[PDB]
Design a protein around this ligand. Structure first.
Ligand SMILES: Nc1ncnc2c1ncn2[C@@H]1O[C@H](COP(=O)(O)OP(=O)(O)NP(=O)(O)O)[C@@H](O)[C@H]1O
Ligand SMILES: Nc1ncnc2c1ncn2[C@@H]1O[C@H](COP(=O)(O)OP(=O)(O)NP(=O)(O)O)[C@@H](O)[C@H]1O
Ligand code: SF4
Ligand code: SF4
Ligand SMILES: [Mg+2]
Lengths: 185, 260, 578
RNA sequence: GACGGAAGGUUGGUGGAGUGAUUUGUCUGAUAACGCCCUUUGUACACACCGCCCGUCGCUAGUACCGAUUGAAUGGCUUAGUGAGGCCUCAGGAUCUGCUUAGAGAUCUCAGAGCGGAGAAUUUGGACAAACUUGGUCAUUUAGAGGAACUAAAAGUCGUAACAAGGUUUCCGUAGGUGAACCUGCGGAAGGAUCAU
RNA sequence: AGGACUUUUACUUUGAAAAAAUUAGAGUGUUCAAAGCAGGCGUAUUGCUCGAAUAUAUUAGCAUGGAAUAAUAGAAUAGGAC
RNA sequence: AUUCAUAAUAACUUUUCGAAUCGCAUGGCCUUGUGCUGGCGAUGGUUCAUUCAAAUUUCUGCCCUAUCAACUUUCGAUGGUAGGAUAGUGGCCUACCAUGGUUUCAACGGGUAACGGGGAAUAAGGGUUCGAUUCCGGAGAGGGAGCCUGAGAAACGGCUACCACAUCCAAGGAAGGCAGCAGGCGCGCAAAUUACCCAAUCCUAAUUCAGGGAGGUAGUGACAAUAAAUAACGAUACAGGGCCCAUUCGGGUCUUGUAAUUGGAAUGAGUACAAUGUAAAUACCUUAACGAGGAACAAUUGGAGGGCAAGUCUGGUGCCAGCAGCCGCGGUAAUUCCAGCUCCAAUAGCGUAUAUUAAAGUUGUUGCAGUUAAAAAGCUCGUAGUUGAACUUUGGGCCCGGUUGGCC
RNA sequence: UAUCUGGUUGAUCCUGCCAGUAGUCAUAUGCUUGUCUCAAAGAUUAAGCCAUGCAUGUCUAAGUAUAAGCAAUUUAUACAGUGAAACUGCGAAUGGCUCAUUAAAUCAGUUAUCGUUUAUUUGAUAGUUCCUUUACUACAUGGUAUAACUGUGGUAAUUCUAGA
């Protein structure tokens, strides 16, 4: 037998499942950004959790330490390239603060809506999950993504499928051919 | 378990062959050879993974079986032959020559060498005793015994070997003021000339070493192996020069300065 | 899924010593109904069959390990390779046409074997007990993937394994294909491709040298079974199948048939026999593969065994998987046709008694019967039957479209109305399906049993019977024979019985007439003498001998020459323990 | 609060006392207060003495333990006796095969005898040691005659032993007796109804 | 090169000696991600090219400073140090 | 550090080695003969080192149990002498001699549903539980014991016998082992196909050209994970914010929701030409030709008294049937039962068991409690164990001199 | 992501459990089931038993090939193209599988063999053996067999084997 392909779960469930404060507040996010499940929210809060604990572990050691410097600069720069944390607070103490809202803002589901063109966030999600849109030459079909700052200006419709160009589609084929042209025998 | 182990899995083999976890269960066990199992590097590993010439084992065998390539300027047709530290891999592919020397991270880089350097190699003398009929002899790290040596050559010293002939062209004594490479373990693939030696009765002579930046350290003498005189190394060193940069200098040079 | 049942007797299965825990801790015993019946006593623990739910709780906590646990045969919509529709026969496992060795395939009659063979050939394709769409090979492959036949069937799809089968029945092959020319001669030449030498070897080692100038229709079923096998053999093909080759043939001529089948096997070829055998399956096959179930309802095929071992398990019954139980006067007439001299001797054809015939195929036993009934002859003298003549045909491949019940109205069910046909078969193996259903689709032993009824059916006493063992096995043969004997002895009749089987002759016999002479030349019928001397006469000429299996009373043919064989040759006796 | 077969003769506002329950006010006959009834104590009751609850007795179901069985089966250990099998040796030499004085007529067996070598069975004695047979020995699940308990009781039968000085203050330790709670001695304690002449 | 002896410990900084895989973790285009150790780059026409780090790894054994805390002693028959 | 490497004498050998081996190209020479020399290898060859290892071995650590306090010493116990035996040291085993070795800082026995590690689960920190399982090491191939052969075995896809099971049979004998792959039976609460293939990654061989269920490739696969379709956009009729140029009385982008009223648009799931993929296919990734408007191509699984989020809605049942992890519901108006309406949770995934971690500061070293709630032993002595006053050189300077931050 | 909440009272505060709660590379089991990637999967009772098939064989320029094989040697009446079979030499002690026993034993880290075996690679390595090297037998290199093979069989049978 060969070595195992390693794995570990990304979502992390809450402790108290029925709570009035959490259920009401978390569902608003889901309604605004258009998240299908609570699992996605929990995933985002798990990544965020990992970042937080890492930052705490960096901060327990002294300043001007080899471990604290390097890791801090790379963590911070990772959080900058994705665009969650802006340029003003690049201090390592600020990454402890942060919030889930910023993370969901940085998802490609809503970055199409924040650009515009897709009207509603739900519509944008539909566009993404139905093979439309692209980061550059590379096509993307997944709502969750994290756009990497430089990628922002290159987001547009893909060459394949309409809006960008190419053929019309199925419904339009049926309207143009099976209905409109087929009237004349 | 009832005799020698012929098979060898991935994972059990050393980390410094850069063997990917997947794309196979097993690894090439190095054949019984000059060098040890864990330190050395198979020829297959040197071909398909490092140099990228061959893809499969098939291709490697087809390259080796037509002579062409040769360790120590000798046929060497077996697939998993242990090419270890400081060995000349002579190829007929556009007159290319290769020396196995350690890197910053304790690996075997594709370090090319001149046609003049291909003539000779080095070797750490491990013991010197009388053989039969009172004839003295030395033994290098790769088992290359040399009959009728110079009495100056004592244990722990280096010998320059001529390959074409089993002879001693030169010898270098073991002390400070010499360029001193270091193999084995934590400080593997570094150079710092020796500051001073330490005796310690009952084995293990920890030597003190001081690199060009004066970041001193200590290593065990068994893993220490010298090279040449101060500012005059008898072999051409690779990129890095046996210094070892910290992670800060790495993030300055290897992911900031080098970019377009 | 199965019916688990308990079993009891053992070596010192001691009820007196144990304080009977079986009784003490069984759930059925402790809820009214006595399943396990025992006491401190001299006998064994008695345990029921019908009651036992299964469980196995007594097994665990019986102090000695006397009581084992068995599983009985029952359908459970499991596997199902094919049905026909409903209230009909179904089949579950068709299997490993394992190559490089001949594969025996054994069972009591009307169990599926033939159907399975057809399925393997790719003529009558399976349907998984469903009413499939146009060529649904895909689905069936998916059903029997994860197993060998995936490869086999896919190969068949692109005819890279060419099909061939020896048919079940013999009378259909000459009638269906009306050839331009008969004989072995040209029709064999058109069939064969293989080579010139192998065919010579076959026809020569088949010890015929008879029917080289003669039409097939004239040939008796025995010399005809032989031809059928020859036509199957020489045909150039990848697959090879022999659906019941060794029926109504001589004991000597069976062995060499088997060894010609053997010829094909070795170099990456697959062979599949079916047979109801004595102990001649020792040479036919290497891999015996028993099938169990209920006749004409369901059939399940067990994974293959070694021949020796498999035959030995067929007898007792239980196996590593399941448990199928199992255990006045006439003158000297001189008769001719064209290429034959069929002479007969005078004899005493006594009242209220049987008469046993034996002989080599082509010894003239059969045409005699025709002439007695009515066909041709004589040029000088004969004795007409006193009693109303009753006849049995060998070449049975009949055609009465509609159903068997309709055809049964031509006889009558209301004579010696007390069992007769029910005493033949009714409780264990059943006759309901055989009494309904078409005769076109009926199998060997059941079709043969159709003709066994057409005998004690029309009002008649004097009886002509040749080859009832055709398409029957040790289960169906012996009881049937016993019933026949009970019929013709009790109510006063006379019957001329003719058998190739040893057990079906010797368990009945008393007066034994013996045929003698070479085929397509001569024929002499010797007078009825004792059972011993007559049988010796029958077998001295054929040059083969038997060995009674000491535990079970069962015949086992010898290996041409051997240590015991030579003693029998020198002594003379070919039948021990009368 | 309620009760006593114990002793004596209404309610919020604000404020204190308390972690509260709440109490104080709404009190000895002045002042943490300002504008049958009662008090104190005892309480295992709180649908509130008709209250709770303790046991002898009958009754369904289980539960372990004890165990008639000089149960039975399976295991490890072992007294005594027996011990195959190879392996090592003392022997043995069926047979095959070299040499030679020597046999036969000019790398020829024809007589044998010596000198050897290879060498199968069989074979004395050893160490190794699987087993087997007898006495046991301990352990283990495993049976289950009937015992002596314990529970789980939908609110039975006789009693009041405790919770009020439960109407013989209450228990502890032991001894004796009693059908049953228990009772009665001896010494102690009070988680007594006395912090006091 | 050395010979001669410096009461011994525990404690603790540093260092090696410290199999990979896993664990935390640096870069990366698995389309994101679990992953994986790939990949970037040219007139993508005979080529160029960084990287597969780093730490974690108690106890036990070694070498190594340090003398605080906690023990342990040479000298009161002075066959006691110079 | 040596009686070491090594040498030199006196010896013995029952005899180790010193190529009677094989292939490619065929020359270079000489007073010229099938003459003298001759390269490139392959495989053998004794010793020495090297490698692969192997075997023993130092110290240090392991799960519960004193209703397991004395064990080991007989035919080995601890030590010594001398031998034998091993590749070897050594009670490993002999003969003699000595009387030791272990231990309550817990030996010896018993249990373990105990192979040991690397690790896994949980996590504030400390911990507790698991580790048959993909790597290292060990052990065993039904139970034991013995042995041939090889460098290497006490080998089991080698052998030998005895025990237990169990096969063919002419009764004369003969052959057995899956805890390798795939399966069949048993036991089960519980687990997959008698499939293809050496193209990979290795390994073995006299070896680039063979063989390898080592392994790899499909299938079966809700054990676990990752991503993530289950529908978006308008128009019309409603209660509205009211916005764009602010020419306040011009028409519709954004709309907050409710409306089987309606018009197009975009797709997948799925069918499949082709190609890719591959040892060869199946998938994936691609993509011609097709494939959404409702019983369409419909998503459930648990709940709705409190804990815990959501119902005092509608009918049946009437302490019955039942629900209920806990408290408790049901005696005829049930916000707990049975259904239906509507709602809530999680959402291609939820519920139910048993084990376990956290919360459990309900094991507590960090970090519990012991007047009355469970708990301080009747009291004292006393060995082990644990702990145990202070006191035995600080200060002062002189320079040399690196690290912090700002005028320079 | 250092968290609690209902259950004993008429109401209170406590000790103290009970139940809830989330996780599980810990399993089963119920219902439901479209896609992609990725995947453990007869361990737990039972190291209980197993039909049957398969899992270790092995060739180059280079050990032995009058196969009475194939296709021909066109350099071959020494073989000297290819090459089944067998002999020889290696391999079969690696692997893969399971965990039953086993508690200072295995085991980890850590030394040591100046108490040793080590096939094979790897590098070195015996000109002195006709011990009468004065004839001594050939060293232009010599003897003993024996499988495959041809043919005669034995047994019911196994990758049983007997003679010649
Ligand atoms: N086409 C058909 N229609 C109806 N019934 C059929 C058909 N084919 C077979 N059967 C039944 O299936 C049973 C078994 O068929 P088959 O395999 O031919 O029997 P069998 O076992 O070969 N008999 P035999 O060869 O004599 O032992 C028979 O009893 C028939 O009644
Ligand atoms: N007209 C004819 N000419 C030549 N031969 C014929 C003719 N008719 C029949 N025969 C054959 O003559 C033979 C007589 O033998 P017959 O009595 O049939 O033997 P049988 O009992 O059938 N034995 P079996 O073959 O084992 O059944 C048969 O085999 C017929 O085939
Ligand atoms: S079977 Fe077991 S229990 Fe039933 S009787 Fe025989 S022994 Fe006693
Ligand atoms: S088997 Fe099941 S049923 Fe038949 S006896 Fe034993 S227990 Fe009673
Ligand atoms: Mg049939």
């Amino acid at each position: 037998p060969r070595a195992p392909r390693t794995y570990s779960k990304t979502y992390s469930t809450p402790k108290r499942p029925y709570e009035s404060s959490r259920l009401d507040a978390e569902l608003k996010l889901a309604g605004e950004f258009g998240l299908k499940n609570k699992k996605e929210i929990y995933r985002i809060s798990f990544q965020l959790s990992k970042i937080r604990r890492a930052a705490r572990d960096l901060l327990t050691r002294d300043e001007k330490d080899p471990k604290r410097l390097f890791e801090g600069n790379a963590l911070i720069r990772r959080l900058v390239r994705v665009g969650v944390l802006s340029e003003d607070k690049k201090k390592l103490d600020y990454v402890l603060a942060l919030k889930v809202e910023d993370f969901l803002e940085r998802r490609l589901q809503t970055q199409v809506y924040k650009l515009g063109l897709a009207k509603s966030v739900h519509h944008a999600r539909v566009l993404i999950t139905q093979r439309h849109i692209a980061v550059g030459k590379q096509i993307v079909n997944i709502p969750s993504f994290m756009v990497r700052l430089d990628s922002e200006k290159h987001i547009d419709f893909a060459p394949t499928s309409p809006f960008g160009g190419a053929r019309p589609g199925r419904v339009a084929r049926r309207n143009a051919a099976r209905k409109a042209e087929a009237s004349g025998e | 378990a009832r005799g020698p182990k012929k098979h060898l899995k991935r994972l059990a083999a050393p980390h410094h062959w850069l063997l990917d976890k997947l794309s196979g269960c097993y690894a090439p066990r190095p054949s019984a050879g000059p060098h040890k199992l864990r330190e050395s590097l198979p020829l297959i590993v040197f071909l398909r993974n490092r140099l990228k010439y061959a893809l499969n084992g098939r291709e490697v065998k087809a390259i080796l079986m037509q002579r062409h390539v040769k360790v120590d300027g000798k046929v060497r047709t077996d697939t998993t032959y242990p090419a270890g530290f400081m060995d000349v891999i002579t190829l007929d592919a556009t007159n290319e020559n290769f020396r196995l020397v350690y890197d910053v991270k304790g690996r075997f880089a594709v370090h090319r060498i001149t046609d003049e350097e291909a003539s000779y190699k080095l070797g750490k003398v491990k013991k010197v005793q009388l053989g039969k009929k009172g004839v003295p002899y030395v033994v290098t790290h790769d088992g290359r015994t040399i009959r009728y040596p110079d009495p100056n050559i004592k244990v722990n010293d280096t010998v320059k070997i001529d390959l074409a002939s089993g002879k001693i062209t030169d010898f270098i004594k073991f002390d400070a003021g010499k360029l001193v490479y270091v193999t084995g373990g934590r400080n593997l693939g570094r150079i710092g000339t020796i500051v001073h030696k330490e005796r310690h009765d009952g084995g293990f002579d920890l030597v003190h070493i001081k690199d060009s930046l004066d970041n001193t350290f200590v290593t065990r003498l068994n893993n220490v192996f010298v090279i040449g005189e101060q500012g005059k190394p008898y072999i051409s060193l690779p990129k890095g020069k046996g210094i070892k940069l910290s992670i800060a200098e790495e993030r300055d040079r290897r992911r900031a300065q080098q970019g377009l | 899924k199965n019916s688990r049942i308990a079993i009891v007797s053992a070596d010192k299965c001691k009820p007196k010593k144990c304080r009977q825990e079986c009784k003490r801790s069984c759930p059925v015993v402790k809820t009214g109904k006595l399943c396990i019946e025992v006491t401190p006593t001299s006998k064994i623990a008695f345990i029921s069959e019908i009651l036992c739910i299964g469980c196995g709780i007594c097994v665990k906590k019986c102090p000695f390990d006397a009581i084992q646990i068995i599983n009985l045969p029952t359908n459970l919509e499991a596997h199902v390779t094919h049905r026909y529709s409903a209230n009909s026969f179904k089949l579950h496992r068709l299997p490993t046409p394992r190559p490089g060795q001949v594969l025996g395939l054994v069972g009591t009659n009307g169990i599926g074997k033939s159907t399975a063979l057809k399925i393997l050939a790719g003529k009558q394709k399976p349907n998984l007990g469903r009413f499939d769409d146009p060529p649904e090979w895909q689905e069936i492959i998916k059903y029997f993937r994860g197993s060998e036949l995936q490869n086999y069937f896919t190969k068949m799809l692109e005819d890279d394994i060419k099909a061939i089968i020896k048919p079940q029945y013999v009378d259909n092959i000459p009638r269906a294909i009306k050839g331009p020319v008969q004989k072995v001669g040209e029709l064999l030449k058109l069939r064969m491709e293989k080579s010139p030498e192998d065919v010579k070897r076959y026809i020569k080692i088949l010890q015929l040298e008879n029917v080289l100038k003669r039409d097939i229709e004239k040939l008796s079923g025995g010399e005809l079974q032989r031809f059928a096998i020859g036509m199957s053999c020489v045909q150039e093909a990848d697959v090879y199948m022999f659906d019941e080759p060794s029926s109504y043939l001589d004991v000597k001529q069976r062995l060499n048939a088997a060894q010609i089948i053997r010829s094909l096997l070795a170099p990456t070829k697959y062979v599949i026999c079916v047979e109801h055998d004595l102990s001649v399956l020792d040479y036919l096959s290497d891999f015996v593969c028993i099938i169990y179930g209920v006749p004409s309802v369901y059939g399940v095929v067990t994974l293959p065994a070694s021949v020796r071992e498999g035959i030995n398990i067929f007898l007792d019954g239980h196996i590593p998987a399941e448990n199928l139980r199992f255990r006045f006067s006439y003158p000297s007439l001189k008769k001719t046709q064209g290429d034959f001299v069929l002479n007969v001797e005078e004899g005493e054809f006594s009242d209220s008694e049987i008469l046993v015939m034996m002989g080599e195929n082509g010894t003239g036993k059969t045409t005699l019967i025709k002439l007695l009934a009515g066909a041709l002859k004589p040029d000088e003298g004969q004795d007409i039957p006193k009693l109303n003549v009753s006849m049995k045909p060998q070449k049975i491949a009949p055609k009465f479209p509609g159903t068997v019940r309709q055809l049964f109205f031509k006889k009558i069910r209301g004579q010696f109305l007390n069992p007769q046909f029910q005493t033949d078969v009714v409780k264990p193996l059943r006759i309901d399906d055989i009494i309904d259903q078409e005769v076109q689709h009926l199998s060997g032993g059941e079709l043969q049993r159709v003709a066994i009824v057409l005998a004690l059916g029309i009002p008649a006493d004097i009886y002509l019977i040749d080859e009832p063992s055709a398409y029957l096995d040790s289960e169906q043969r012996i009881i049937c024979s016993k019933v026949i004997r009970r019929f013709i002895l009790h109510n006063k009749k006379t019957a001329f019985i003719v058998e190739h089987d040893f057990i079906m002759a010797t368990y009945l016999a008393d007066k034994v007439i013996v045929f003698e002479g070479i085929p397509s030349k001569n024929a002499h019928a010797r007078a009825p003498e004792s059972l011993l001397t007559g049988c010796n006469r029958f077998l001295k000429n054929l040059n083969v001998t038997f060995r009674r299996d000491p535990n079970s009373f069962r015949p086992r043919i010898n290996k041409l020459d051997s240590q015991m064989d030579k003693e029998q040759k020198s002594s003379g006796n070919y039948f021990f323990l009368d």
